[PDB]
């Protein structure tokens, strides 16, 4: 039981691209050095989200076939996946300093209504003990979701997403041959990710009192 050369090539382009992401040291130093207050904490989260959306655009452009999609559908795919991918990555980092980051998140003027499900997701992610390939493929499968709003040619997206779900399943069979439910638990994370879209919308919608960054305002229609 092994990946085909074609699947190995596909997986390789995904890992290479995923592996390039980074948080500038300029930003990380702020997590450690800036004042501790709901206002500052919220501003730091904002800066992090912005840097991530940038990292997310660079990753997506290297996804096999992404650049062959209609230009507007490329935009629609990014706007609809940004929150989901940002929560997936947050999960990853939290499950592998982090002490102070966690403290800032819990004290950034954000309701427990949001914080609670957030930290619970980090927990269920950790319990899965995901590999780097799993995190990368899940991130791409989340990006290449053919069912997002405003997509003109959904079938062209299906064509890119299907092969990723095929490789992810095979990896589960090859690496966890005795736990036939592994794939199923990864999908449970896909559906759990979708719940953060509504939550996030309410966090944005319902605290007008506040300026974000230009990049965030466009992706989230603020």
């Amino acid at each position: 039981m092994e990946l085909t050369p074609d699947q190995q090539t596909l997986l390789h382009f995904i890992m290479d691209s995923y592996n390039k992401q980074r948080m500038p040291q300029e930003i990380t130093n702020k997590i450690l050095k800036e004042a501790f207050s709901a206002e500052e904490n919220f501003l730091i989260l904002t800066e992090m989200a912005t840097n991530h959306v940038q990292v997310l655009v660079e990753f997506t452009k290297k996804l096999p076939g992404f650049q062959t999609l209609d230009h507007e559908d490329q935009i629609a795919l990014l706007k609809g996946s940004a929150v989901e991918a940002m929560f997936l990555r947050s999960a990853e980092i939290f499950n592998k300093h982090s002490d102070l980051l966690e403290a800032r998140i819990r004290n950034s003027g954000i309701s427990d209504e949001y914080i609670t499900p957030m930290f619970s997701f980090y927990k269920s992610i950790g319990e899965l003990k995901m590999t780097q390939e799993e995190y990368a493929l899940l991130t791409a499968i989340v990006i290449l979701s053919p069912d997002r709003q405003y997509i003109k040619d959904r079938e062209a997206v299906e064509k890119l997403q299907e092969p990723l779900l095929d490789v992810l399943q095979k990896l589960c069979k090859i690496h966890q041959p005795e736990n036939p439910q592994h794939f199923a638990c990864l999908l449970g994370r896909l559906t759990e990710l979708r719940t953060f879209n509504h939550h996030h919308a309410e966090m944005l919608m319902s605290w007008r009192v506040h300026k974000f960054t230009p990049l965030l305002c466009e992706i989230w229609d603020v």
Binding site: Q54, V57, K61, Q74, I75, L78, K79, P214, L215, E218, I219
Partner: peptide, 13 residues
């Protein structure tokens, strides 16, 4: 003119 920054990042090199 919408998503100007997003388009700039997506369309750049």
């Amino acid at each position: 003119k919408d998503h100007q920054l997003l388009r700039y990042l997506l369309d750049k090199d």
